[PDB]
Homo-oligomer: A and B are copies of this chain.
Amino acid sequence: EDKKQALLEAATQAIAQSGIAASTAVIARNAGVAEGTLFRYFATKDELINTLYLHLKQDLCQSMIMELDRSITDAKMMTRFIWNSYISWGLNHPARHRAIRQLAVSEKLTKETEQRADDMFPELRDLCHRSVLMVFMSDEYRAFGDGLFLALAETTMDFAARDPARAGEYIALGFEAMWRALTRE
């Protein structure tokens, strides 16, 4: 539904600007529909959080797969592509990125929502289990591992954005920082 879609887009800008606490009424006005129209698509605010996130994460992963040169047979060079695509996505889509960050840090994501976010780039689990330190694949510390990678990717992005001039150098500098910190001997 272009109407569903409109709602997802309005939800993106509203959440980007105000957080998950963004009024379900304000979302509806910006989408041109009535608060009830929305309730028929997203039963609860939590189910919205979860559907947005999947839709944003989908988008994020389409960019990555598309930019991924499947002829790259080197793990580090492969990780470079993911790192590069992840950063470009955020730079070219500030709202989608702000929004997806809130959702992911909202504490309202179902485990169901998690497993659906993986099936969108399964061969990507393949990279980690090759390069990443055993402890960061650990059931106890993988969340932590991904976190470090993410905070590292976010700062690189802040810099690249605030100082366009040098982005390429930040992006490179940030990758090597993350490789030495997260990756195997």
Q: A: which residues have CB within 8 A of B?
A: 105, 107, 135-136, 140-141, 143-144, 147-148, 150-152, 154-156, 158-159, 162, 166, 169-170, 173-174, 177-178, 180-182
For the residues of A in contact with B, the DSSP-based class is helix
- A148-B152 in contact (CB<8A): yes
Task: Give chain B residues whose Cβ lies under 8 Å from the Cβ of A148.
Answer: 152, 155-156, 174, 177
Given contacts A173-B141, A177-B181, A180-B181, contact A147 B166 (CB under 8 A): no
Q: A147-B155, A180-B180 provided; 14 other pairs, C-beta below 8 A?
A: A105-B158, A136-B173, A140-B166, A141-B170, A141-B173, A144-B155, A144-B173, A147-B159, A148-B152, A148-B155, A148-B156, A150-B155, A152-B181, A178-B181
What CA separation (Å) do A180 and B136 show in the bound complex?
A: 15
Most chain B CB neighbours (cut-off 10 Å) among A147, A150, A156, A182: A147
What CA separation (Å) do A180 and B169 show in the bound complex?
A: 19
